[PDB]
């Protein structure tokens, strides 16, 4: 790979990371995080604005070109028998399927399923 190739990938924060260590990154859910170094499985190094620092690798999600990122606006319980999922308000998800019957397939990074478009706001 070319040096710094990690930086060409689009990632968004899934969680609030409040910096405590001197070299910790600090970010909020939905922010774009540039990944600088992913060599270590425990902590990645990334950049947001004017800080380069360490952060948890599973606190960010990859967004491929054309992909849509949403913030859940209302907690909703889906019918699991027809591939629906339950999400809480304020969760961050990536859309993975075209809208059908007022539902879109979304990914939290831990789970995937259909969720209502009425309860999502694009970020």
Swiss-Prot record:
Kindly list the places in or outside the cell where this protein is found, as annotated in its UniProt entry: Cytoplasm; Cell membrane, Sarcolemma; Cell membrane, Sarcolemma, T-tubule
Q: Where is the signal peptide?
A: none
Q: Which residues form the SH3 domain?
A: 6-65, 66-123
The superkingdom listed in its UniProt entry is Eukaryota
Under the subunit heading, UniProt states: Interacts (via SH3 domains) with the calcium channels CACNA1S and CACNA1C. Component of a calcium channel complex with CACNA1S and CACNB1. Component of a calcium channel complex with CACNA1C and CACNB1.
Disease affiliated with this protein? Congenital myopathy 13: An autosomal recessive disease characterized by congenital weakness and arthrogryposis, cleft palate, ptosis, short stature, kyphoscoliosis, talipes deformities, and susceptibility to malignant hyperthermia provoked by anesthesia.
Function in brief: Required for normal excitation-contraction coupling in skeletal muscle and for normal muscle contraction in response to membrane depolarization. Required for normal Ca(2+) release from the sarcplasmic reticulum, which ultimately leads to muscle contraction. Probably functions via its effects on muscle calcium channels. Increases CACNA1S channel activity, in addition to its role in enhancing the expression of CACNA1S at the cell membrane. Has a redundant role in promoting the expression of the calcium channel CACNA1S at the cell membrane.
User: Could you tell me what this protein is called?
Assistant: SH3 and cysteine-rich domain-containing protein 3
The coding gene here is STAC3
Q: Which residues of the full protein are shown?
A: 245 to 364 of 364
């Amino acid at each position: 790979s070319n040096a710094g190739f990690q930086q060409s990938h689009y990632f968004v924060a899934l969680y609030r990371f409040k910096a405590l260590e001197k070299d910790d990154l600090d970010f909020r859910p939905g922010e774009k995080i540039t990944v600088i170094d992913d060599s270590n499985e425990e902590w990645w190094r990334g950049k947001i604005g004017e800080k380069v620092g360490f952060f948890p690798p599973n606190f960010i999600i990859r967004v491929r070109a054309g992909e849509r990122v949403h913030r859940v606006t209302r907690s909703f319980v889906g019918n699991r028998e027809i591939g629906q999922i339950t999400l809480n308000k304020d969760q961050i998800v990536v859309q993975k399927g075209d809208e059908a019957g007022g539902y879109v397939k979304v990914y939290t990074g831990r789970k995937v399923g259909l969720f209502p478009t009425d309860f999502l706001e694009e970020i």
